Every structure is written in C-alpha cells, then in structure tokens.
Design an enzyme around this catalytic site. Structure first.
Site, PDB file in Angstrom:
ATOM      1  N   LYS B  46       0.795  -1.243   0.000  1.00  0.00           N
ATOM      2  CA  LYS B  46       0.000   0.000   0.000  1.00  0.00           C
ATOM      3  C   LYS B  46       0.815   1.275   0.000  1.00  0.00           C
ATOM      4  CE  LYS B  46      -4.065  -1.754  -0.156  1.00  0.00           C
ATOM      5  NZ  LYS B  46      -3.910  -3.064   0.537  1.00  0.00           N
ATOM      6  N   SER B 269      -2.695 -12.822   3.851  1.00  0.00           N
ATOM      7  CA  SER B 269      -3.019 -12.839   2.424  1.00  0.00           C
ATOM      8  C   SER B 269      -1.900 -13.390   1.522  1.00  0.00           C
ATOM      9  CB  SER B 269      -3.443 -11.435   1.968  1.00  0.00           C
ATOM     10  OG  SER B 269      -2.329 -10.580   1.953  1.00  0.00           O
TER      11      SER B 269
HETATM   12  C1  LIG Z   1      -4.144  -4.192  -0.342  1.00  0.00           C
HETATM   13  C2  LIG Z   1      -3.817  -5.489   0.225  1.00  0.00           C
HETATM   14  C3  LIG Z   1      -3.965  -6.663  -0.660  1.00  0.00           C
HETATM   15  C4  LIG Z   1      -4.483  -6.566  -2.082  1.00  0.00           C
HETATM   16  O1  LIG Z   1      -3.852  -5.592  -2.917  1.00  0.00           O
HETATM   17  P1  LIG Z   1      -4.777  -4.713  -3.898  1.00  0.00           P
HETATM   18  O2  LIG Z   1      -3.865  -4.060  -4.899  1.00  0.00           O
HETATM   19  O3  LIG Z   1      -5.530  -3.765  -2.990  1.00  0.00           O
HETATM   20  O4  LIG Z   1      -5.716  -5.726  -4.521  1.00  0.00           O
HETATM   21  C5  LIG Z   1      -3.665  -7.908  -0.133  1.00  0.00           C
HETATM   22  N1  LIG Z   1      -3.240  -8.079   1.130  1.00  0.00           N
HETATM   23  C6  LIG Z   1      -3.057  -7.088   2.031  1.00  0.00           C
HETATM   24  C7  LIG Z   1      -2.580  -7.409   3.430  1.00  0.00           C
HETATM   25  C8  LIG Z   1      -3.354  -5.696   1.629  1.00  0.00           C
HETATM   26  O5  LIG Z   1      -3.176  -4.696   2.524  1.00  0.00           O
END
Ligand SMILES: *Cc1c(COP(=O)(O)O)cnc(C)c1O
Ligand SMILES: *Cc1c(COP(=O)(O)O)cnc(C)c1O
Lengths: 310, 310
Positions: B46, B269
C-alpha cells in the site's frame, strides 16, 4: 533475471533520506540525513550480521544445518536476524534474551520458529550471555556466533554499510553518528571511511544511564539495542572521535518525532542517535557539514513499549 | 548524491525471491517466485498507492496540507501508508477501520499520529466505508482519496510494480498471482504485461467465504487485506484469466510455512496467494512456467492474530 536465491541475498543496500522538519526546528546548522536500516528484510541493521556471521562459519566448516544448534544471547534484533537466516537455511536456533526487551521481539523469534529462553530483567544482557554460554558449554553441537566478538560483524559493515554511505554521499560524508550495541556498525564505518577522508568523524552514542564507553559504570536503561553494559571486543575506541551520552527521555522524544514529523517510524535507539546528531549538528564548526545518522530499527517492533503504548 | 528527499521517494522497487522448500514439498512443476511487498518502507504494497493517490490529488490542486482532512476507510495497510505519507507531508488524517483487523494496525496508525475511528466488526468494510463517507459529506475540507475507485491506484501498479516484474524476469514471467483487496495490484500488472506477452496469465485470489469476484455472495473471513465483500470499481475482470478461491485455513497454513520454512515472514493474504500459486503450479500445462506471486505484507503486523498467537 534478477531473482534472489533466498532472503539472505537481499539484506543491506539501504537508502539515505534527508530530514525536513526536525533539524530546522532545533536550529541545526549542519545537514542531517538518515540511513534507514529499518528497510532490511526483517527491519533492522542486524540482518547484515545474521547473514555474514552464518556465511563465515559455514564457509569455514564450523557449522552445518543438519547438526548445529545455534545459540545467541540478544536484545532482540540479532536474534531475529539469525531466526530469519535459520528459517531459510534450516538451522535450529536458541535465543536467550532479557525479559525487559519488547514483547514484539519475543513474538518475532517464535514466528520464525526459533526457540527462546527469557532471562531475568534485573540481570540484563549479562544474564542472557551467561545463560547462552552455559548452553554452549554443555550441549553437543551447540555453537555461538558470538556477536560481540565475531570479526564478521565489523567486516560486513566495512564492506556493505560503509561502502553504501561512501557511494551515496559521493564521498562527501563528514560525520557518522551511531549508537553502539555490539559496536560493529560504527567501527566498520570508521575503518572503511577514515582512510579515504582523514577529517571524517565517527561518533558513538550510548545511554547516559550506562556510559561504559565513556569510562563510567553500567546501569539499567530503556534504549533497547544499545548500552550492553560492557565494552564489546569488536568495538575499537581508537577509531571513534567521541562518545555522546543520551538520556532515555530524549531518545523516546526524538524517536516519536521521527515517526510523526518525518514519517520515519523508528526504534528507540534511532531517537538517541538523532538527539546526538542534533547536538553535533548545532556546533558552529559543523555548519554545512554532512552528517549521516544510523537508524538501526523500524518502530513497529516497539508499539507495545512506552515509546507509543498509550 | 543519492539521498531521497523524503520517505515517499523510497516506496516500491521491491525484489523477487525464489522459494526453496515449499514448491518441491508440494510437487510443484512450475517455478514459483515471490515479489516482496513486505520491503516497502511501511512493510506493505500500500505504500505505493499512499504516495500515488496523494501526489495525484496534490498535483491537481484538490488537497493541501494546511487545510485538507484526509479520510479513508481501510483494512489497515492503506491507512498505514497514508499515515506515513501524511506524517511526512503534514496532513491531518482520519481512518475508519473494522475492529476485526489486527491490533498492530491500530497501533501503527496512532504511532504515525493519525486519528482512528474503529467501526463494528459485524459490519466489515461496508461499515468502515459508510462511516468515512459520512465524515466526508459532513466535514468542511474533508477529502477521501477513495482507494477502491482512484485511478492512481492501478496506474502506479502499471508504472512501477508491473515494470519491476517485467524487468526482473527479463520479460519471461508467465503468470502473476495476486489476492484482490482494491484490485489495483493485479489489474495494473495485467494492463502493463498482457500487451507485451499475449499468453501471460493474471490470476486473482479471493476468500472462499466471500467469493464475490467469482459471482458469489459476501461473507466474513479471516484473510485480512483481501475480500472487501464487493467488486471494486478499479478491478477489471476482463483482464483477469481466472479467480481462485482460498479457505482461511489454507491461507494461515501457508503463511506460517513462508515464515518457518522460507524465512519470509508474511501476512495472511500472502499465504492465500501461495496456496493459489501452488495449485496453479501443479497443473501439467504449467510445467516450467515462471509464476510470480505477490506477497502483500510483512508478518510482524500479524503477531497478535491467530496466525502466530500461541
Ligand atoms: C491491499 C492489500 C492486498 C491486495 O492488494 P490490492 O492491490 O488492494 O488488490 C492484499 N493483502 C493485504 C494485506 C493488503 O493490505
Ligand atoms: C544492534 C543494534 C544497535 C547497534 O548496532 P551495533 O552495530 O550492534 O552497534 C542499535 N539499535 C538497535 C535497536 C540494535 O538492534
């Protein structure tokens, strides 16, 4: 293809960043820039020595993943660096660490799959070291890389940290300021740069409550990562121009300002280094000199401490 | 001199690393490598959009540090990225975030000096978004960069994340696997790379408990950072070859293995993305293909969660 073999080949090569608010607020006449050791893979300067010490011992045939139990006393970051290396390479690793160090450090060690034995807070690093020594003496195939003595510690700083500073400042750095834990950072920097720049100054930082580099007696303090309570064997006082002592309150205050006024979320010891760099940078003789301070760690590891809690 | 003006000029340019244990253990026939977004300054992907969205709005004269109150609903990382940017640039910032997100995320926001309003866990991201919208509608000079809609989100991924993958794989990447939160990462990657490599595959990952990209209904799940519960406006389904759904248990399991078996301490994630990449990499048609998975975040932010706690 630029694809690293594993995480150990991605340590170091950290950037410099200027400060934009704090120096002017304090009337600093020098230019203070920060080397961000927060950007190592496990978010501290120790990643460099975790890799160098292990590679050095492996190359000499002294350790092997199938048999060696690595054992190291730590205030946290060396343990974490070794835990990352150990996880990548398949070593068993036991850390001893005083209970006074941040809760995040304990959880980091366990997350990487290392074993942790906490030692009494009242005994400080001495307690951690004594316990690690007991484990090594007694346990077959136990091995301590010995971060306070291992030549690979100052060596990796000579070859990487110092060269990065030299290159990134186009050979114009005038002063480096660094807190001393093992002493490897500031020692390796002074060793590499002084031969190239006779007037260069290497300045060590230590807690005012435990001013052992200054010739004083050890005591308890809150600047995690510095102030071991003894002079490490790797530290070379003859290469260091001066030692600046720092109060716990000033370390905490300046680390908070790093996060909130510069967007540089930093450990407590980075605060101590900044307070020192401010003092040095206000000296009339240092007007327009380029001062690089080392930021040893990222501040996420310190959220549970008095730095930010409440 | 290579000295960054401020922390915002040090985001992105993250490395690739091969995996050395997990793929062979699972019988993977492809080559799986990881893009480490954990190595951004505030330890998630981010950082890239915090910088791009703010720079874009500033350039158009839409926000100014002396008057704008930035307001953003977040699962944590976008809030942290904006909090770092805000601290560097002098913006006031208010985040709304569901109470279900990790405690570390809350503490990170406060450490950078941002304001946080928690919203009820049962309402999920929808609750956070509704509250942020209420603040913006009502408050003079409040402004939401709107991470699910802002074109600067996929744009920065087209221009940086995707170019890095293209360069670092010498144009040979065959498949990118990425969880979808805002969708900017996988969308920007597909937009840049597909024109250069017709057979390239862009694969999205989502929680099996909230399979909205797959045409299913939203539900609660533990994969923080993905599975918003709606299809983001920035997400372009026409560019994505397939969506892989992942169980919470598999995300947790593979994130733990990333830390302990690869030395890659990772968010939940990243575990979901790896489980997916394993499934894709085992397909006979993908033998010897080069698969890059995105690791969105560093795992230190998750120590208090079920990922590692106990
Ligand atoms: C933002 C985020 C994602 C996904 O990325 P995007 O570009 O927003 O789809 C996955 N995992 C975490 C922990 C995130 O902060
Ligand atoms: C190691 C460490 C230091 C000091 O670095 P050395 O090279 O050991 O002197 C400072 N702060 C923190 C947080 C550390 O972990």
């Amino acid at each position: 293809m630029l694809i690293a073999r594993d995480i150990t080949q991605l340590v170091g090569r950290t950037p410099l960043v200027q400060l934009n608010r704090i120096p002017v607020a304090e009337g600093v006449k020098a230019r203070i820039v920060v080397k961000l050791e927060s950007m190592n893979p496990a978010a501290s300067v120790k990643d460099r020595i975790g890799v160098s010490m292990v590679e050095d011992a492996e190359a000499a045939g002294l350790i092997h993943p199938d048999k060696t139990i690595l054992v190291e006393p730590t205030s946290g970051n060396t343990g974490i660096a070794l835990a990352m290396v150990a996880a990548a390479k398949g070593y068993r690793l036991v850390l001893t660490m005083p209970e006074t160090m941040s809760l995040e450090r304990r959880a980091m060690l366990k997350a990487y799959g290392a074993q942790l034995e906490l030692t009494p807070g009242s005994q400080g690093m001495e307690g951690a070291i004594t316990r690690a020594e007991e484990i090594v003496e007694n346990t077959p195939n136990a091995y301590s890389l010995q971060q306070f003595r291992n030549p690979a510690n100052p060596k990796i700083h000579r070859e990487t940290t110092a060269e990065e500073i030299w290159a990134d400042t186009d050979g114009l750095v005038d002063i480096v300021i660094g807190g001393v834990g093992t002493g490897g950072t500031i020692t390796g920097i002074a060793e590499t740069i002084k031969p190239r720049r006779p007037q260069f100054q290497a300045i060590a930082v230590e807690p005012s409550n435990s001013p052992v580099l200054s010739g004083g007696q050890p005591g308890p303090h809150k600047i995690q990562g510095i102030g071991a309570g003894f002079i490490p064997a790797i530290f070379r006082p003859e290469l260091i121009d001066e030692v600046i002592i720092v109060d716990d309150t000033e370390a905490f205050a300046y680390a908070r300002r790093l996060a909130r006024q510069e967007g540089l979320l930093s450990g407590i010891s980075a605060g101590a280094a900044l307070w020192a760099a401010i003092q040095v940078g206000k000296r009339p003789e240092n007007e327009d000199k380029l001062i690089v301070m080392i930021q040893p760690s990222f501040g996420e590891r310190y959220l549970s401490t008095a730095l930010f809690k409440d």
